[PDB]
Amino acid sequence: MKSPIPLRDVPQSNIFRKGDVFVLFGELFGRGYANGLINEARDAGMTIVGITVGRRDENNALRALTAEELATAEANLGGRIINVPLMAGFDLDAPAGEPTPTDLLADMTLKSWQDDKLDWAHIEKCRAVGVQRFKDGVAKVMAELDGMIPDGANAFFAHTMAGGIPKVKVFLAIANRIYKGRGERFLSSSALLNSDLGKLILMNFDEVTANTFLHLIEGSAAIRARLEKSGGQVRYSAYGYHGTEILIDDKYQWQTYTSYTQGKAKMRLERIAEDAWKQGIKATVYNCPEIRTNSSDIFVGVELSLFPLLKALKKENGGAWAEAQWQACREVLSEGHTLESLLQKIDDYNASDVMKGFRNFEAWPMPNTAELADIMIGTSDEITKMHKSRDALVTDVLSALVLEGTGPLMFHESSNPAGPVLWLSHDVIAKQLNLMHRLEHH
Ligand SMILES: NC(=O)C1=CN([C@@H]2O[C@H](COP(=O)(O)OP(=O)(O)OC[C@H]3O[C@@H](n4cnc5c(N)ncnc54)[C@H](O)[C@@H]3O)[C@@H](O)[C@H]2O)C=CC1
């Protein structure tokens, strides 16, 4: 697409009932986006089922969960977990006794990594082994799930998977320079992406963040057909990131965190949804706002995009509850610092020529720059130092609100989706949150 495809109106329809089955295709963590959606599924009375990625033994081989592990995971999910290790990516896959891609990274150093070259034939061999492992896993899971979804049921498959970062020591050093580095410690995104290391990482990102959705859609085809033929409905959702419209100069304008390294994989995810949609499959990627979760915590500055949600809460027919949210955010700031000052510093940030330059949709994701690093990391740091405690942040409050709002948006839109790719920006999320709280006054 050449511009965002916004969802503007709060959806009101629902087809899901007791007996219908919600499948979490990913693991549920605290602060995770999926919390919003799964709670909706739970309150609609759906049967909750999920997958596990399994665990690694110390021979670094994949294993299913133990009884104890499974019980814990199932209590955390609030439903059954199918005990098959559905770990995506190929960074730890290889033919028996041969190096993994991770092994091939083992002798890269801080001095050598930009120029180190990889045996791409071997990496391709590993990719094939890993991909076939994941497909075989998906077939296992779908075989078991098929027996759990009766004829006539509706099924909701919710994809959440994103990742593919290799567990090697050199990369997090490189990462701290790319994501947090200023001045002489700045390292451009391009430096990583042009290296063989970066190329490998991007291949893994495509596998985990994008191709897993395709494997979900293909792997569940028999179930889909049987349900569709027996009066059921089937839906697929995925969490996308492709920038977000936020209030800049009292207008909702698309912007993004830069540089979003998963960007190529997220656009491949979108393409998978579009291809499936043309085949009559109801698959939708929901491009959701920047928040702080386990997967985005490292992206220092990503959270700068979230603060103007406060202004959206007021703009979208905010009343007493929105005012209470402002009060809540005021309370975590140190005496002498006002929420107004915080928000003005964010408006100043988006007003800057440097930041205005990154509002280029067609160029997304753009490479970062030293100027970007200085203003983004500087601003993020300043705002964090406005807080009473660095463990109680305005962004904690606001990230929880976005979970809460995107939940019903995705759950209800999936009953009758407008298209294969939809943006949930601050406008529609604020509308949803104010509407949910229309009875909470004072
Ligand atoms: N946090 C943010 O700012 C945004 C996140 N998203 C997307 O939301 C989705 C959920 O992520 P978050 O809630 O942010 O964090 P999270 O850490 O709670 O979720 C990550 C999910 O990816 C799964 N995952 C990671 N590696 C995997 C692997 N090798 N194999 C199989 N599954 C794997 C995890 O089980 C988990 O379900 C992701 O796709 C993310 O890209 C979308 C927009 C913004």
Explain what you see.
This protein is of the alpha/beta class. It has one domain (21-436). The protein has helices at residues 34-43, 67-77, 101-105, 120-146, 169-180, 189-194, 196-219, 221-229, 263-278, 309-315, 320-331, 339-351, 353-356, 370-385, 394-413, 426-436; strands at residues 21-25, 47-52, 55-56, 62-63, 80-85, 155-159, 234-240, 244-248, 251-255, 283-287, 421-423. The strands form 3 sheets. Strands 5-2-1-6-7-10-11 form a 7-stranded parallel beta sheet, with helices on both faces. Strands 3-4 form a two-stranded antiparallel ribbon. It is globular. The PDB classes it as oxidoreductase. Keywords: Enoyl-acyl carrier protein reductase, FabMG, oxidoreductase. It forms a monomeric assembly. NADH bound structure of FabMG, novel type of Enoyl-acyl carrier protein reductase.
What is the secondary structure topology, with strand pairs?
Layout: E1 21-25, H1 34-43, E2 47-52, E3 55-56, E4 62-63, H2 67-77, E5 80-85, H3 101-105, H4 120-146, E6 155-159, H5 169-180, H6 189-194, H7 196-219, H8 221-229, E7 234-240, E8 244-248, E9 251-255, H9 263-278, E10 283-287, H10 309-315, H11 320-331, H12 339-351, H13 353-356, H14 370-385, H15 394-413, E11 421-423, H16 426-436
Parallel strand pairs: 1-2, 1-6, 2-5, 6-7, 7-10, 10-11
Antiparallel strand pairs: 3-4, 8-9
Helix pairs in contact: 1-15, 4-7, 7-9, 10-16, 12-14, 15-16
The structure holds 1,4-dihydronicotinamide adenine dinucleotide.
Binding site for NADH: 27, 33, 88, 160, 162, 266, 291, 293, 295
Keywords: Nucleotide-binding
